[PDB]
């Protein structure tokens, strides 16, 4: 809708609540609002008042030591968009040290344009982790929310579910909650930044956040770009001018604000490019009749004066004060203590300056990576100097790698010396390149630039070592390179070789295990020169590695340290045959099949093509064919470095002193299977209850002939059948003429393995169980069984067969009456 309320420039509230009563008819705030230091308050003093008309904060909102407020939604239930023209240590919402605050309640926010949110040190705060800040803010990695009750403890966040949308923040769909009875509004992604209505329809293109009617420029709650009489517009039409990047004013408003500073004590407003601007930039001037920035002839810059010479740049709210400057009166002390990348906002704020009268000092900055945000820095004058006569000071910059890019950039340092200490990713070649570009070569004294602190973590050796002769094997690499000599050859201590395995190609520079190399012996001729190399040994087959060679040297401060290094190249082992396929286990379900299970071996060696599984039926043992198991013995198997640096320099010092003192001037086809892409194989079509020979090989190459591994041997046996050992067929008798019974039966032709014994349980009626053992040779001798010398009567003969697996089934009792020779 429209804006019911007055313009309301930003005031400051302190120590009693009487000046909070001036926010009745306020729709927007042009400025910052700081509700701070509220000591003699109660929770009964805050719930009886509300200001629901307020919609927009331009600069920031600050809360600092306010007692008794348990949620801020009693104050501001309709705060929509925080803009962020001026900031507060690059934040627009600082909530610091709230005692007796438990929840936020700020449900009507979904966009803050420029800045971040830092909430800390609230000792009773909950509902912090249940807000998805990714749809609230743009740079969401510059948030800093820590040290509250919601991360120290595990207070219960009661969420309204039975309705809130469940979004993701790391891996889980948890509901987005503000209070116990207010959901967080999440628009669909077709409404990108324009917002959605209550039914989820996208609003107008100049709407922002909330609209009562979708695709309506008159019904936006907050304008996105500019405001003119209830109509959100992308730009101001003439004669309306832009004002503070949020609204359209006319000529009389900027003229009256010019007259309220010209006839008073301030920001005397001008106009340029149809925008009511505080000051004219460089090349422009101020008239008397009209307020326009007409072009000033000649060199006519913007000159900004610093307060007492020094300005300490610490954040964006100090960087934005020097916006549009070209000539700096004094010295800049850039000290950004950070952890977040602030180079883009410092690029957008600074970089329009040309000349610095004092000195540029960088000190203790962690989060900078370059000093190229000064896009237009030409002349450092050094009229006011750092004590020690330095026009440039660089101490303890942790991640500073490059000063500038010297393909295009250039700097003219007039007076003063140079200073460099504790810059571990910065190199002396870059320091000497800035010394050659700036022309300050013979100006500083010795030990103004540090020699051992700089570049100790960055590999900037600035020489290339070409790998000359590389040959591979199964698990050994012959590495070679061209020989390099520093011009005192005894300062070369050897080669500082580094090795690592490489699953990828984007291996980082500078784990990372090490071997050390003896230096070569030169023969002072260029004929052979003894290309040094290293025989690399003890590797893994079919593994890409990461090989680079750095030169280990001896420091001398009259020159540089020294430097030569090689690029991180990769080498491939290719191999021939893999290792033993392990885990031999033999599972045999049923009687005609055996499944096989195994693990892959330790060498993949390229593609696992197939597993070469061999099987062949092993015959039974010869010694169990003839052994009498009716005899006794019937058991059958049921089947430091610096000391070495000092030693090398001690040898060089002794050769130095000795030369100074002395020289003075005056088949068989087994059944096998190509088992592709499975760790299991059923081997069916078998003989039941016999041994098998199982040979397993891991073949890494199939098509340009079969290369297979060394074999693994295991044996197996199936389960016995049910009726293989059961005696089938009737048992017939041959009763002889002298009471001799000769027994004929049909033996099992294909039993479980073999049957070693035939037990006979024969029972006369009126008698007990009598036993007689029939072995295999007893069966072959008597073609069955023979009974000799027995009592007359009817018998009941049951015969079981005892196999290698065990007993079979008993036969039926054959009733026969032998001759009594009495009756």
């Amino acid at each position: 809708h429209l804006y019911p309320g007055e313009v309301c420039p930003g005031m400051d509230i302190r120590n009693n609540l009487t000046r909070l009563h001036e926010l009745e008819n306020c729709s927007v705030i042009e400025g910052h609002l700081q509700i701070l230091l509220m000591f003699k308050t109660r929770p009964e003093d805050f719930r009886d008042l509300s200001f629901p008309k307020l919609i927009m904060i331009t600069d920031y909102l600050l809360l600092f030591r306010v007692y008794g407020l348990e949620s801020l939604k009693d104050l501001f239930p309709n705060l929509t968009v925080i803009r962020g023209s001026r900031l507060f240590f690059n934040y627009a919402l600082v909530i610091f040290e709230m005692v007796h605050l438990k929840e936020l309640g700020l449900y009507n926010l979904m966009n803050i344009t420029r800045g971040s949110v830092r909430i800390e040190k609230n000792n009773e705060l909950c509902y912090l982790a249940t807000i998805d800040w990714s749809r609230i803010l743009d740079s969401v990695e510059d948030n800093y929310i820590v040290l509250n009750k919601d991360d120290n403890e595990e207070c219960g966040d009661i969420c309204p579910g039975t309705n809130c949308p469940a979004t993701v923040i790391n891996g889980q769909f948890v509901e987005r909650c503000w209070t116990h009875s207010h959901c967080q509004k999440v628009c669909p992604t077709i409404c990108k930044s324009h917002g959605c209505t209550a039914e989820g329809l996208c609003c107008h293109s100049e709407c922002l956040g909330n609209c009562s009617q979708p695709d309506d420029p008159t019904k936006c709650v907050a304008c996105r770009n500019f405001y003119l009489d209830g109509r959100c517009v992308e730009t101001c039409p003439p004669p309306y001018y832009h004002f503070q990047d949020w609204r359209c004013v006319n000529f009389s408003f900027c003229q009256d604000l010019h007259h309220k500073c010209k006839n008073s004590r301030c920001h005397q407003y001008v106009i340029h490019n149809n925008k009511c601007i505080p000051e004219c930039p460089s090349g422009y001037t101020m008239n008397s009749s009209n307020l326009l920035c007409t072009p000033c002839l000649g060199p006519c810059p913007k000159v900004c004066h610093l307060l007492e010479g020094e300005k300490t740049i610490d954040s964006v709210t100090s960087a934005q004060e020097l916006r549009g400057c070209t000539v700096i009166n004094g010295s800049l002390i850039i000290n950004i203590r950070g952890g977040n990348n602030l180079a883009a906002e410092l690029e957008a704020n600074l970089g329009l300056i040309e000349e610095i009268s004092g000195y540029l000092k960088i000190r203790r900055s962690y989060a900078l990576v370059s000093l190229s945000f000064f896009r237009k820095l030409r002349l450092i004058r050094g009229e006011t100097l750092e004590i020690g006569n330095y026009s440039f000071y660089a101490l303890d910059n942790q991640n500073l790698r490059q000063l500038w890019d010297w393909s295009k950039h250039n700097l003219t340092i007039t007076q003063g010396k140079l200073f460099f200490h504790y810059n571990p990713k910065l190199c002396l070649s870059e320091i000497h390149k800035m010394e050659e570009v700036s022309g300050t070569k013979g100006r500083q004294e010795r030990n103004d630039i540090a020699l051992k602190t700089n570049g100790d973590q960055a590999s900037c050796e600035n020489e290339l070592l070409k790998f000359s002769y590389i040959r591979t094997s199964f698990d050994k690499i012959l590495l070679r390179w061209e020989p390099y000599w520093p011009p005192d050859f005894r300062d070369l201590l050897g080669f500082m070789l580094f090795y690592k395995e490489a699953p990828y190609q984007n291996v980082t520079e500078f784990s990372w295990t090490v071997v050390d190399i003896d230096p070569p012996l030169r023969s002072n001729d260029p004929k052979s020169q003894n290309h040094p190399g290293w025989l690399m040994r003890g590797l893994k087959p079919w593994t890409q590695y990461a090989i680079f060679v750095k030169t280990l040297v001896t420091f001398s401060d009259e020159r540089r340290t020294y430097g030569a290094k090689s690029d991180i190249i990769y080498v491939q082992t290719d191999a021939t045959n893999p290792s033993v396929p392990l885990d031999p286990i033999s599972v045999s379900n049923s009687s005609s099949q055996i499944i096989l299970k195994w693990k892959p071996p330790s060498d993949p060696n390229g593609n696992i093509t197939h597993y070469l599984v061999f099987w062949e039926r092993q015959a039974e043992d010869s010694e169990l064919f003839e052994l009498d198991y009716c005899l006794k013995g019937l058991k059958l198997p049921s089947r430091q470095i610096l000391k070495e640096l000092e030693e090398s320099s001690f040898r060089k010092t002794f050769e130095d002193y000795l030369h100074n003192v002395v020289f003075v001037p005056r088949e068989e086809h087994r059944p096998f299977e190509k088992v592709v892409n499975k760790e299991s194989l059923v081997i069916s079509g078998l003989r039941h209850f016999t041994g098998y020979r199982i040979e397993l090989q891991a073949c890494n190459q199939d098509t340009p002939e079969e290369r297979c591994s060394v074999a693994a041997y295991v044996s197996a046996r199936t389960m016995p059948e049910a009726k293989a050992d059961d005696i089938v067929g009737p048992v017939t008798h041959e009763i002889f003429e002298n009471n001799v019974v000769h027994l004929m039966w049909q033996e099992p032709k294909e039993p479980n393995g073999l049957i070693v014994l035939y037990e006979v349980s024969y029972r006369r009626y009126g008698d007990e169980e009598l036993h007689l053992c029939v072995s295999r040779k007893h069966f072959a001798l008597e073609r069955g069984c023979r009974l000799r010398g027995l009592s007359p009567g009817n018998y009941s003969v049951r015969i079981r067969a005892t196999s290698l697996a065990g007993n079979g089934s008993w036969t039926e009792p054959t009733y026969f009456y032998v001759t009594d020779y009495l009756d």
Binding site: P487, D488, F489, R490, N524, E655, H659, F663
Partner: peptide, 18 residues
Amino acid sequence: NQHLCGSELVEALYLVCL
């Protein structure tokens, strides 16, 4: 005409005035 240090200093200086 390089730098002459070590054993190459006495080995090149022997060939100067032999």
